[PDB]
Symmetry: T
Subunit: 143 residues, 12 copies
């Protein structure tokens, strides 16, 4: 079910919104500004994805999650409790989560295709393009 | 302690970020666009307040909350589980929460003053101006 | 005399500048923002008309009114002492005043024509276009 | 045939361009501005869709319709002869037509897929995303 | 009657909106872009004139036409069924129609003057300035 | 009482809005444009202060003044009946009024502090910064 | 004849374009920048009027003047041979010429009216509004 | 293999970047500016496609070509050695190359589909939309 | 003498300002807009060069020409009395004049160098770059 | 005395303006651009603070320092004579100076409060917010 | 040596940065705003020249001055200790300093030419153009 | 011969356009974004230089190179076949090439001077300023 994949992705997006703020506040090193600026763009991206997933769910006739409690229950992202990082650590953690998201949107696209949902396919494939481009760039940060 | 008030306000801001999205997606009535547009501005405001409170905490030498789990634990805002509202309902709920926030920033300002924290006073009083202006306008929606 | 019509219109414009602020501050209902935004545009329009009429008077070799005392003496607009309205009330009151202004600019145009004042005719007819377009829209608010 | 679906959609787009202007001019109620502004955006959207469909037809080697006479002949949208509406009526009528358009673009996408026309599929699915998002919002206006 | 002239002009404007799109899609020659760009500006101009005429009619207390069926019935512009043109042909056809429109707005201005309708005179004379400037330029294209 | 100081300041702001227009229209000398431009900025500033004071009053639960009649009754600014000035005269008159306003906002800040009104203090101190900067510059015009 | 008035006005506009440059380069006094900036705007205004008059002539089926030789022959403006001025001198000279232009556009409007040329009337009356506003301001510079 | 199609397309894009500059510098005829402006947009388009193809290759885990030597080896576009053209010649040559590119992106889309590469499909179909729209317009230049 | 070359160039610039307007108004052919737009840019360029040359003369301690009479006396450009052209004719005439200007700025640069005037050299060489780029493009229009 | 604190802060601001330029020109490392860009923003900040402090002093009725000689005499910042740094060194040096400035503005605020200078308090507290936010970020660069 | 001229010019630029601020704060007269605005532009110009000279020195392989102490030692500009001026005084003082700078950049250009430093010549000649244009305008302020 | 130097520089510019893309795609390290952004600006700079050199050649009456084959034949830049770099490597390689370009533009300027080509001198010296500024900054990256 497309709804099931979307609702779980909606949970991840808000959970990641929070996580990336952690990285945003707590990066250490001469690198501070680059990471601080980049993590800002990323968390704005997740606020964006959060809203879009929710409205797609609503467009499909279902209820999006409306509480952080639901978010915590349905998320597959483990929350980060550390409060200090260097650039390398942050890039590694974001990469891991993006790889997770990439698999999920791959499934989203395949599932929506089977159910004949052209709109959700299109949304998934667009997100996939963004995640794969970022994944490539992230891997280069760590080489 | 100023830190204690900030950390609790940081929790409310993210919790309200979520709540206002609920209102944003689930408003019903010929009023849809006005509320949908206004709730968008409001939740962007809370993402803003969330970040600013967190960075003020960090500036004070302490750790801001970095998980939705901490947010849920420390918040004083009850999460909204309903998924359908008319404009009147949304405005009433936002008003209630703003009144709560207004009392908290009033305390923030008084507490930071006692501790000689001029910067946090200034931030609190600015937030207070915003909340009191909105409260007035919100009350007018309901009259 | 064209000067006589302008000087009385100048008085109305400032009096209406004030009146529309009343509507702007004191509108009640879920409608608040629409009316609050619209009344803002309207009172800026009257500040505009106020200045333009005054400078046209000056261009004609006469003295524009320079006091709120003169404004009160020369105005044909009754000031609104109520401090609470719903959208319907505000739209009705603005309509009444616009109809008054429309008759005055109709006279302005006819009088300036007789006196061979092409510039004041042009200004009057432009104001007339604006007032007639607004009048139509205002009437639709009330149907 | 993809051409057949496009040519009929081109007819609807111009017919709806006209219909939405009717709603735009003839809305009644304190709601006037919201609807007047929204219907403006919608009819600009249809002028847009009109042109794009026509040029896609031309790209496919065929002739787009070039007369209002052809438009009337090929349209599936019944023209609105009433000249007075409240917001609720307008939203209901637009919804009905959007549901019709949504089915047509669903067919467009399926048909173009069978004929191996990747470009028309992409255009259809994009239009579908727009129509489904609007349909959801429209339904919320009426609840 | 001013209303009669406006209602017929409203019909022409939408009919020309359509015609100019034909020219826009179907121009041939190394000239393609110049004509394609210029016809785009022109048809946007007619969408504009269409709306303005309709709202002027409404301001006068009457009903604007609200159907392509009425448009076809009331228009004086013959629809173009050819689907291939060179720049010279397009400029000739637009000129012919502009000359027609120019005579109509000349009448509009004279008629509205007799009926003491200063606003419609002003609108007509403005349109006349635009049409006469374009007519001059169009004639130069063909010399 | 903070309300009492605000209501009197609201009266001055509209009275000064009018006065500065007088200076704006009636400045004489090769200096015309500088003064004409500067007085424009100043009267826009007072329209601004007028609205802000009124809304602060409303936020405090009271009614702002809504008539030019109330304005005249409550103002401490004497209206200017002269209709001709050189730059030096205008700068002297504005200075006198700014000094008056400066004392009033000084009181506003002190009074709001005693009543624990942090928001009105903040507004007063901001206005004070603006008035003191202008006062300095104004004095330099006259040296 | 409207053509005769336009052709003479076209000559004045280019002659004044040149004259105002003289004032622009050769102003003396602490006033330099104000006059230098203002004369720049004025000469751009005359380049504008020059072109518009020429194209109106062309729209009327006649030939605009195309040489500085024709300009000199047909102008009523005496060229300024002095190369040094104070602000007062420049404002006096511009005023004199504007008064001349004002009479000419007054005639233009009357003549075009008799010949039933609504477009040239409209252009003349607009220019008249600009000249009368400037004349008023210019006179104030010299008082 | 999707990689094989991309690497060959990357070669064409840089080769065409160069070719279109030739057309850009060496167009002859009264047409110069139109072609010069259009070829500028086109070569910027190919710099764009060049980079995007390269980064897609990198995202797929392979190495994009990094030398003009590789470009020459892998390209299917014959380089243009003539240094003089009229508009007709340039449009014919660009059309031929666009038709080649269109077939290649058609293959790209089909191949990426078989390999389950949703992102490359999406990129190919978008490029296809652009190429087919341009092809249509190009053909019209030559009719 | 550098002054002598500048004063003659100043005369040409205003004379060409006029000439290019002729081309601007009187171009014939399907080419109208391209030439009309291009000649507009060119005459604005000459207004620019006119002013800059004049101010350079003034900077050198001399008087720039301040009359169209001086312009006619000192110019080397023959005025164009024809009032009808095709694109080819206009481009030929502009080329001829640009070649003249190019030789003059070549001399300007050489002369200013001998007199050790680094500023005038720099201005001349910049103008030369512009003229040589345009000359090349102009020649291509005519091939 | 508030004046004494301001005059010493004014000296530091210009001295730091200079120092930060040193860092701006002389940073070494792959880090060059980040530091070069950041130091640019910082020195513009000090030019800003320099001017604002000076004008506040003037507003208080005293003379700001007007010479680099006075600046050197009154500054508490030691000038940096080294001409080569890595990012770490620059961030350490800026931090040290910001900590100094932070203590000074803390004193400024306390002193102005005692003297009842609400405007200088407000300015100091704003500067304090900026310095404390930067200090936090600077410390993170060095961890 | 080019380095010697640059290092002395770098000192003057910062010294003038300071001096022009003095004029900026301490101008007296109805002229205040014109001078205050103009001196702001000028001191921003010197901050600009300061940085550019320093970076040119660095590009030449040498160390720019990095202290106000070096600036004072190497400057040829006498610092202004007066704290009160009328427009005439300020313009006279700036002129004197610009004449000094003009001679220095004249030398800079000649010296860099002898040493075959094309880049420094180009920079000097550009500065020279700016200084000579300003000098002319400044002289006109004082006539 | 100036033509010979330009034609070889044109070859280098396109070859470097390609090389810098390699660096752009294949940078490794936490530094990724800084280098990726900077290399983007650089390759756009070379596309720019490529076009400008080509058009200068054309302005000189000769044919610019129009093939990558000619580019390879005439270039002095060795192509980079490695596909992995850290920031340090990229900056070293760009520096080496910039030093080469700097010598070439030094020659360009000297050669064009001998041939009396003021325009090419000016272009060369401008490029030289850019290259020398970048060279300085590049060297600082590596220290």
């Amino acid at each position: 079910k497309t709804f099931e994949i979307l609702k779980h992705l909606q949970a991840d997006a808000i959970v990641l919104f929070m996580k990336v703020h952690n990285f945003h506040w707590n990066v250490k090193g001469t690198d501070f500004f680059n990471v601080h600026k980049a993590t800002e763009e990323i968390y704005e991206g997740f606020a964006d994805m959060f809203d879009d997933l929710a409205e797609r769910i609503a467009q499909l006739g279902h209820h999006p999650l409306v509480t952080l409690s639901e978010a915590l229950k349905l998320t597959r992202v483990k929350e980060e409790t550390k409060t200090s990082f260097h650039s390398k650590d942050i890039f590694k953690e974001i990469l891991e989560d993006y790889k997770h998201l990439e698999k999920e949107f791959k499934e989203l696209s395949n599932t929506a295709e089977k159910e004949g949902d052209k709109v959700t396919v299109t949304y998934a494939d667009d997100q996939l393009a963004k995640l794969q481009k970022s994944i490539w760039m992230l891997q280069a940060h760590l080489a």
